[PDB]
Amino acid sequence: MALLTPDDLININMQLQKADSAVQEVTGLDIKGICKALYGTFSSSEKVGIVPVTSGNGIIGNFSASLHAITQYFGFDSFVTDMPDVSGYYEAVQNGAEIILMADDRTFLAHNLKNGKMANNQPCTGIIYAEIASRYLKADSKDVLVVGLGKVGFPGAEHLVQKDFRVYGYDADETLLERATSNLGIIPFDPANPKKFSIIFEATPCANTIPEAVLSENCVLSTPGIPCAISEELRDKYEVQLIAEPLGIGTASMLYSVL
Numbered sequence: 365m366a367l368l369t370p371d372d373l374i375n376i377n378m379q380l381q382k383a384d385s386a387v388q389e390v391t392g393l394d395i396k397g398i399c400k401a402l403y404g405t406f407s408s409s410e411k412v413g414i415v416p417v418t419s420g421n422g423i424i425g426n427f428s429a430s431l432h433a434i435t436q437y438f439g440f441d442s443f444v445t446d447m448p449d450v451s452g453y454y455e456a457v458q459n460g461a462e463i464i465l466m467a468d469d470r471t472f473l474a475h476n477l478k479n480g481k482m483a484n485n486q487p488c489t490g491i492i493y494a495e496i497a498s499r500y501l502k503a504d505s506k507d508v509l510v511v512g513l514g515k516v517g518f519p520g521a522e523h524l525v526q527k528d529f530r531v532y533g534y535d536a537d538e539t540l541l542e543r544a545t546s547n548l549g550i551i552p553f554d555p556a557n558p559k560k561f562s563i564i565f566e567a568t569p570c571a572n573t574i575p576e577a578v579l580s581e582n583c584v585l586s587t588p589g590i591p592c593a594i595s596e597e598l599r600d601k602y603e604v605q606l607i608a609e610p611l612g613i614g615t616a617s618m619l620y621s622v623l
């Protein structure tokens with residue numbers, strides 16, 4: 365239901381440069397490094413076919429151009445097919461793609477035809493954004509607050525629990541908070557009894573989901589969420605270190621995961 369617009373993807377190369385610097389500042393690693401920690405993998409110029417898809421709301425302005433940019437940035441031999449849909453898929457396989465990258469309104473996937481691995485953008489994004497959050501060099505705690513427990517949030521929290529962090533979760537939807545607590549063992553967080561975190565992961569499609577009362581100074585807020593989870597004011601007031609970028613960090617996570 366929450367979908368990228370062309371405006372979100374303006375100057376994707378700067379957005380990506382900027383997010384990569386923030387990731388380096390927070391964790392000591394660039395995005396490649398994070399991906400190598402998660403998956404053990406690295407790029408070797410694998411050939412990536414990017415197929416536009418016209419189903420649902422259709423082709424999104426700047427979407428495949430941005431994927432072309434992203435993939436090039438990380439050292440893949442990528443290209444965008446002239447035809448969309450099934451015809452484009454055929455064009456890609458025939459033009460030697462080893463990994464297919466394509467999306468409809470519900471699923472963005474990467475499929476590596478050589479080894480059979482396939483990634484879904486939603487867990488891949490939650491996993492990398494959570495990993496990045498957790499690796500905050502100067503956090504001084506293994507307490508992590510996770511706001512948003514849907515298709516992106518839940519796998520991030522799960523990753524974090526598997527990584528032996530002490531995870532506190534909140535979702536405005538009590539059903540999703542309940543499922544996360546009874547399937548993962550996270551501690552349910554209460555906005556009425558807040559404590560401060562130096563590590564925060566947000567995966568929501570809503571503004572101002574991070575209360576002032578949970579922010580410590582210099583804390584990290586890692587969020588795939590659109591629009592921004594915290595106001596500029598609160599972000600300046602606590603010099604929060606923001607990692608937020610619309611497509612490329614999740615895309616890298618999908619790609620490095622199928623290698």
Ligand SMILES: NC(=O)c1ccc[n+]([C@@H]2O[C@H](COP(=O)([O-])OP(=O)(O)OC[C@H]3O[C@@H](n4cnc5c(N)ncnc54)[C@H](O)[C@@H]3O)[C@@H](O)[C@H]2O)c1
Nearest residue numbers: 366512514515516535536537567569588590609610611614
């Ligand atoms: N930057 C990227 O690369 C990237 C990749 C994937 C998704 N996204 C974005 O991530 C966001 C989340 O995606 P999703 O698929 O998990 O959505 P989802 O609907 O599956 O989950 C969103 C969750 O946030 C909860 N929520 C809404 N307002 C809240 C509030 N104030 N407090 C706590 N919880 C609240 C909802 O109850 C819901 O459970 C969307 O904005 C989507 O566009 C970004």
Ligand SMILES: NCCCC[C@H](N)C(=O)NCCCC[C@H](N)C(=O)O
Nearest residue numbers: 367368416417422423424427467610
């Ligand atoms: N950046 C958020 C995560 C990636 C998926 C994103 N939610 C999204 O907008 N998905 C829809 C993508 C549709 C792509 C369209 N069929 C196209 O090929 O241009």
Ligand SMILES: [Mg+2]
Nearest residue numbers: 611612613614
């Ligand atoms: Mg991203």
Ligand code: NA
Nearest residue numbers: 568570589593
């Ligand atoms: Na948000």
